[PDB]
Design an enzyme around this catalytic site. Structure first.
Site, PDB file in Angstrom:
ATOM      1  N   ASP A 760      73.263  27.397  92.411  1.00 32.40           N
ATOM      2  CA  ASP A 760      73.501  26.545  93.761  1.00 32.40           C
ATOM      3  C   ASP A 760      74.402  27.333  94.398  1.00 32.40           C
ATOM      4  O   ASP A 760      75.129  27.062  94.270  1.00 32.40           O
ATOM      5  CB  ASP A 760      74.756  26.009  92.538  1.00 32.40           C
ATOM      6  CG  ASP A 760      73.603  25.148  91.245  1.00 32.40           C
ATOM      7  OD1 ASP A 760      72.384  25.056  91.351  1.00 32.40           O
ATOM      8  OD2 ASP A 760      74.243  24.663  90.356  1.00 32.40           O
ATOM      9  N   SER A 761      73.733  28.582  95.318  1.00 29.71           N
ATOM     10  CA  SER A 761      74.118  28.714  96.011  1.00 29.71           C
ATOM     11  C   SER A 761      73.705  28.530  97.355  1.00 29.71           C
ATOM     12  O   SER A 761      72.074  28.019  97.093  1.00 29.71           O
ATOM     13  CB  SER A 761      74.716  29.801  95.864  1.00 29.71           C
ATOM     14  OG  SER A 761      75.804  30.832  95.441  1.00 29.71           O
TER      15      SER A 761
END
Ligand SMILES: [Zn+2]
Ligand SMILES: [Zn+2]
Ligand SMILES: [Zn+2]
Lengths: 1131, 48, 44, 66
Positions: A760-761
């Site tokens: 989740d970047s």
RNA sequence: GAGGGAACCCACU
């Protein structure tokens, strides 16, 4: 002519646009406040009894007619002024209007006539005014007039200004009043229980609850008892019926059992008759009731009066409270017992607590009415005390000095300021969070907070049923928008077309029923009740009807043409149970539905054509309601309607699955709330991701309001370049998201590039960020004021001098002007003075109490405002502006729950590129998609590629068959791109083609409020708490981090005992005490003179030095305060 | 109660003063015991 | 010093302990002048 | 709030095109034809003008403090 | 070269 299916989408969004042109989005708050001001305040003043006072002279005070002015300000000079909302916000005023009243004082002497004093328009306090309501000064103003007053025309209103702070009243759920609900209490002595939270209509009084319960089998038989208000013990129900005035068993059973040819009801009422046979008279039953009262009187006649007062005034107030209204109360109590027997037989289903037609929503109206009822009672109490004092020893009292306006004024101000809904001295036993500070981070957050519902069930409860998404929430409550964590399911949001009913008087419906062939309960024999239909009006059984179908047809015809019955009245025919329930009360949540007659909409092309020229024909939504085309259906009525999801369900062939549709949904996507209506393709996403986006759309930075330059909010966030989405929903046309957007359409490539977007970047384009991509501004306001806290104490805004002021913080003061205030345009840093305030010390005549900038928050002073507060001291507010460039660690979210922090930023020459030279603005990881199944993100990206190539705004209304993935794919292939949105990308570092082809296109992203610079915090050593001498709390106080219990357990399991000692002893609070070697108590040690003396032992040489935490010393001294001797033995 | 025992006073006023002293000491030690009113600060908040 | 009135756009001289009122229109909300100090922005 | 000077993705000048785009839309062009007449070929430059919300016009409706 | 606590609410993982 009928609307063809090819024109239906355009027609239904026309009628939705008409609805939102009339009602808006905060209509429930404004309508409840207008009902409170116009009707509820006057009714509360009326229902308050006149004050009769005797020493003797008799004085009768009667409050007659209220007068409410417009919100005016009085300064210390005393000249009134029209107080504007920005003046209230800036000067920290309360936006309240004075409330006057007409009082009559009559004097009754001995041997003298009555004397009248007409104290006209007597000021009794100040009512805080909801913004953009009827009595607000912004009412009826055009957008140009609002802009000339520095108000945003897009601002909805619906909130109050209390001490300059915007406060919204969250709507509160409660069980519905005057309705019989039968449940089955588990693991209790009761098999079933009937409950009626009875509250008298047309008045603001507390609800009296009666419990008609049945004992469990585990007892010769199971018996029915009654738990009455103000009665300590349970009373058998036959005793209550006898004390009501019916001694025979035949009359009681006629009131309870309507068909005497039903033997099982007789069998179940047999134990109660057997139990209560020993009482056979009304007075004996009243004696039995009064024997179990709150305070049983010694006189039997006193017990008779108390029992009569309980049975008349406090037993079922809604069916009747006046004298000789006991037969209606007896029929209602018999109906409760009959419902209990029906549940006992299994002949009727148990009521559902989570069913949302059994719930009412206390909006600002009812809550403020409850407050004002209590405080007007308090004001009359204090007036009674004052006038009693000056008729006891004196002869006369002045009425203007008798009234304390501080009661009403400061009670309303306190309850709206704190949210504690009650009194100031009883804050622990009152509900909190009713009034909240209005969220102003985004326009969507403002709308969502203004349409917020709350279940007042404690968040520590671990039962799931109130938190569950009930079936009855369709179209009323948004199914996606709920908080995460302890408040999931309990805090709800309104659907877009949901409207909460405001209340009406039952009198026109009651009169119409009286002369539309309904026979009263007083004039009928019970033998007619068995085959007839019981009629309930606001839960009051008022009569029976022999022809219920034509009665419901007549009532629906009256409501549809806006005759005697108004539109918000709910009418429910329980056909199987032979009941008609008419509800006119407030708090019923309803929604408009198109009326269907014989598989055809009553909405024709003439209505759509008239609504296409809304501002020419003066045809509006209200004309559509008056035409009998749409009607408002609440949750109780919705359980009897037959809804077509679309008009395609009507125009259906031989097996339509139903040929008796009664209503049609205007559009199904209207079941979403404000925050869930910005999600594109929400039906292509997993539902928790829609919930997460409904959470994060309130944290997205855009332009929260148009007049943000006027306002000095404590926290403010303004994006440089907010864009409307390329892929919108039609419901977004009424959330004003096209005018106040929060986000940027970003070229997003879903690819694994250099590994910096994992877990989740996102990778951002540094060259894009340099061009203003997602750049924002943080505004912080600092308030300070001179205050005269005593005659000698005098805080003053002065530029301080080092040789004159006591205890400076070693900072620079040159940036201050000689008025003590910093100037706009001046760069400031974390250790800088912005407001120079000195307080006189009673050579250092004054000490430094200057306002400092928050640490590490560098910026530039944007604005400085100087004014006067309520009590006439100088008041300064300073807005400091800081530019937030996107950074590694800043949180970004798409509109599909795809949150993520920026992991790295690459320049344009390092990012992968297409053959046209397009680099992504944001690269997200592919692994964010599969477990989430946010396919609406992919479809939004594809539709945005099509939209940006075609030059149009893509439509992503949820339930739309005109939009399909295949259609978007063919449209994309028509523009020279691969139909699935993939492109051949080239490596930025090497120029070689990436072997896989990358999904890439425009997707709407949001910059969330959570920057890393507002969260990064380190402490080496610094401030400590006074009591336990441990480090402080939070980054704002230079505090330490908590090495909690779980960390202690982890370091135990690691075996690192010296690290555990470092964290829990000498990185937190080292301390040295001296203890006696004999008694173990802390000794008295003078380290300067080396005098180590222990009292209680006469010991001056057996003292030892012990290193302990300061919290352990504090624990031992607290234990010694509790007469415990913790004796530290060194042997 | 020092005053009420140093000079003469009735039995019931002495018992009431004993009751108040007992309540104050107990609420110094334990302010969340059931059956008695909570010791409260004049703002209405209870004491710790 | 010089404070702009919020309503009437006019500049007014205000000394210390003087109540903040516009001598023209009697408006109580007034704003400081932009500073004369020299502030440099990178154009980034 | 105001049209960006550069396209965020590529850096093509779009700050001189907002009034021309509004004039083309007033001249009964479609949005795609108006974008094509201004030389915005890449869809990254087309989202600059297609999705722009010109909030500065409504900000100019407030009387200035300065 | 560093002078309040408490309560409540919102939010974050
Ligand atoms: Zn000792
Ligand atoms: Zn002025
Ligand atoms: Zn471009």
């Amino acid at each position: 002519d009928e609307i063809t299916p090819d024109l239906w989408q355009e027609a239904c969004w026309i009628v939705i646009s008409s609805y939102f042109d009339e009602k808006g989005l905060v209509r429930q708050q404004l309508d409840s406040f207008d009902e409170f001001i116009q009707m509820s305040v006057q009714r509360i003043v009326e229902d308050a009894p006149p004050i009769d006072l005797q020493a003797p002279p008799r004085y009768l005070l009667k409050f007659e007619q209220i007068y409410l002015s417009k919100p005016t300000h009085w300064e210390r000079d005393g000249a009134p002024s029209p107080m504007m909302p920005n003046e209230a916000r800036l000067r920290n005023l309360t936006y309240s209007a004075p409330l006057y009243v007409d009082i009559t004082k009559t004097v009754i002497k001995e041997g003298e006539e009555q004397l009248q004093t007409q104290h006209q328009k007597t000021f009794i306090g100040k009512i805080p005014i909801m913004l953009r309501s009827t009595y607000c000064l912004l009412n009826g103003l055009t957008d140009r007039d609002l802009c000339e007053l520095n108000e945003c025309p897009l601002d909805p209103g619906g909130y109050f200004i209390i001490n300059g702070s915007e406060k919204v009243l969250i709507a509160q759920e409660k069980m519905a009043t005057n309705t019989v609900y039968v449940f089955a209490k588990k693991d209790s002595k009761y098999a079933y229980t009937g409950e009626c939270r009875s509250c008298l209509e047309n008045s603001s009084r507390p609800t009296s609850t009666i419990w008609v319960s049945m004992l469990a089998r585990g007892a010769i038989g199971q018996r029915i008892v009654a738990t009455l208000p103000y009665i300590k013990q349970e009373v058998p129900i036959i005793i209550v019926f006898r004390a009501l005035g019916f001694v025979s068993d035949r009359d009681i059973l006629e009131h309870i059992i309507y068909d005497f040819e039903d033997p099982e009801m007789m069998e179940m009422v047999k134990p109660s008759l057997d139990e209560a046979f020993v009482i056979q008279e009304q007075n004996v039953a009243l004696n039995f009731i009064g024997s179990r009262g709150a305070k049983p009187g010694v006189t039997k006649e006193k017990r008779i009066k108390y029992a009569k007062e309980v049975l008349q005034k406090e037993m079922l107030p809604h069916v009747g409270v006046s004298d000789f209204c006991e037969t209606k109360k007896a029929y209602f109590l018999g109906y409760m017992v009959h419902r209990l027997l029906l549940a006992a037989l299994g002949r009727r289903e148990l009521d559902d607590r989570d069913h949302y037609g059994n719930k009412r929503l206390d909006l600002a109206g009812p809550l403020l009415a409850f407050l004002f009822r209590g405080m007007f009672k308090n004001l009359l109490k204090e007036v009674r005390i004052y006038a009693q004092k000056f008729i006891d020893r004196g002869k006369d009292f002045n009425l203007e000095l008798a009234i304390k306006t501080r009661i009403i004024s400061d009670g309303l101000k306190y309850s709206l300021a704190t949210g504690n809904w009650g009194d100031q001295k009883k804050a622990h036993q009152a509900r909190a969070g009713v009034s909240q500070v209005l969220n102003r981070l985004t326009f969507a957050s403002t709308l969502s907070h203004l349409r917020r519902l709350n279940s007042p069930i404690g968040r520590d409860g671990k039962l799931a049923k109130p938190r569950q998404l009930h079936n009855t929430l369709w179209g009323m409550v948004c199914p996606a928008e709920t908080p995460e964590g302890h408040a999931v399911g309990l805090v709800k949001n309104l659907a877009l077309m949901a409207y909460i009913s405001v209340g009406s008087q039952p009198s026109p419906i009651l009169e119409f029923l009286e002369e539309w062939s309904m026979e009263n309960l007083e004039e009928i024999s019970p033998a007619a009740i068995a085959d007839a239909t019981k009629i309930f009006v606001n839960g009051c059984w008022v009569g029976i009807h022999k022809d219920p179908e034509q009665l419901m047809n007549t009532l629906r015809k009256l409501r549809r043409q806006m005759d005697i019955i108004v539109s918000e009245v709910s009418m429910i025919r329980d056909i199987r149970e032979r009941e008609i329930r008419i509800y006119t009360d407030a708090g019923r949540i309803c929604r408009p539905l198109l009326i269907v007659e014989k598989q055809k909409l009553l909405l024709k092309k003439r209505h759509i054509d008239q609504l296409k020229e809304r501002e020419y024909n003066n045809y509006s939504w209200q004309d559509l309601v008056a035409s009998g085309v749409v009607e408002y259906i609440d949750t109780l009525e919705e359980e009897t309607v037959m809804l077509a999801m679309t008009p395609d369900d009507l125009q259906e062939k031989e097996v339509a699955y139903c040929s008796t549709y009664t209503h049609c949904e205007i559009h199904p996507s209207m079941i979403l709330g404000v925050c869930a209506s910005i999600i594109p393709f929400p039906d292509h996403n997993q539902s928790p991701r829609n919930t997460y986006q409904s959470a994060m759309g309130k944290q997205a930075m855009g332009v929260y309001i148009t007049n943000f330059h006027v306002r000095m909010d404590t926290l403010a966030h303004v994006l440089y370049y907010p864009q409307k989405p390329l892929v919108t929903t039609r419901s977004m046309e009424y959330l004003r998201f096209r005018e106040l957007p929060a986000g940027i359409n970003s070229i997003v490539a879903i690819a694994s590039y250099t590994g910096y977007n994992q877990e989740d970047s996102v990778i951002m384009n540094r060259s894009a960020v340099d061009r203003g991509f997602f750049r924002s501004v943080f505004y912080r306001s600092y308030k300070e004021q001179e205050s005269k806290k005593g005659f000698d104490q005098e805080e003053v805004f002065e530029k301080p001098t080092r040789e004159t002021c006591q205890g400076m913080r070693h900072a620079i003061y040159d940036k201050l002007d000689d008025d003590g205030l910093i100037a706009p345009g001046v760069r400031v840093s974390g250790d800088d003075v912005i407001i120079g305030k000195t307080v006189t010390l009673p050579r250092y005549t004054k000490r430094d109490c200057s306002t400092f900038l928050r640490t590490s928050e560098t910026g530039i002073v944007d604005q400085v405002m100087v004014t006067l507060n309520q009590e006439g001291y100088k008041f300064c507010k300073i807005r400091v502006r800081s530019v937030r460039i996107p950074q590694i660690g800043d949180k970004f979210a798409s509109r599909h729950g795809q949150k993520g922090t920026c992991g790295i930023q690459y320049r344009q020459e390092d990012m992968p590129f297409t053959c046209e030279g397009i680099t992504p603005d944001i690269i997200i990881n592919p692994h964010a998609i599969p477990s989430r199944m946010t396919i609406g993100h992919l479809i939004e990206c594809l539709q945005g590629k099509v939209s940006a190539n075609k030059g149009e705004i893509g439509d992503a209304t949820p339930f739309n068959d005109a939009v399909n993935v295949q259609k978007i794919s063919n449209l994309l292939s028509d523009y020279g791109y691969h139909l699935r949105g993939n492109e051949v990308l080239y490596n930025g570092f090497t120029g070689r083609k990436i072997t896989s082809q990358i999904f890439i296109g425009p997707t709407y992203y949001q910059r969330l409020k959570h920057m890393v610079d507002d969260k990064i915090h380190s402490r080496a050593r610094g401030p400590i708490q006074i009591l336990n001498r441990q480090p402080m709390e939070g980054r704002s106080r230079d505090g330490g981090l908590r090495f909690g219990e779980m960390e202690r357990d982890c370091q135990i399991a690691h075996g690192a005992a010296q690290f555990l000692r470092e964290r829990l002893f000498e990185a937190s609070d080292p301390y040295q005490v001296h203890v006696c070697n004999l008694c173990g108590i802390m000794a008295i040690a003078n380290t300067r003179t080396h005098t180590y003396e222990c009292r209680g032992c006469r010991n001056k040489t057996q003292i030892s030095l012990v290193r302990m935490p300061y919290a352990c010393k504090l624990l031992f001294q607290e234990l010694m305060s509790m007469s415990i001797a913790p004796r530290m033995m060194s042997v | 109660l020092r005053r009420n025992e140093q000079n003469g006073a009735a039995a019931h006023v002495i018992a009431e003063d004993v009751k108040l002293l007992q309540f104050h000491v107990a609420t110094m030690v334990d302010n969340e015991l059931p059956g008695l009113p909570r010791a409260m600060q004049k703002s209405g908040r209870p004491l710790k | 010093m010089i404070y702009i009135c919020g309503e009437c756009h006019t500049e007014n001289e205000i000394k210390s302990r003087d109540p903040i009122r516009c001598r023209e229109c009697g408006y109580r909300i007034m704003y400081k002048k932009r500073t004369k100090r020299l502030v440099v922005f990178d154009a980034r | 709030m105001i049209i960006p000077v550069r396209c965020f993705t590529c850096g093509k000048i779009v700050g001189n095109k907002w009034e021309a785009y509004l004039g083309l839309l007033q001249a009964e062009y479609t949005e795609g034809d108006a974008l094509d007449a201004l030389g915005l070929k890449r869809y990254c430059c087309r989202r600059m003008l297609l999705a722009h919300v010109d909030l500065i016009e409504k900000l100019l409706n407030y009387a200035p403090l300065e």
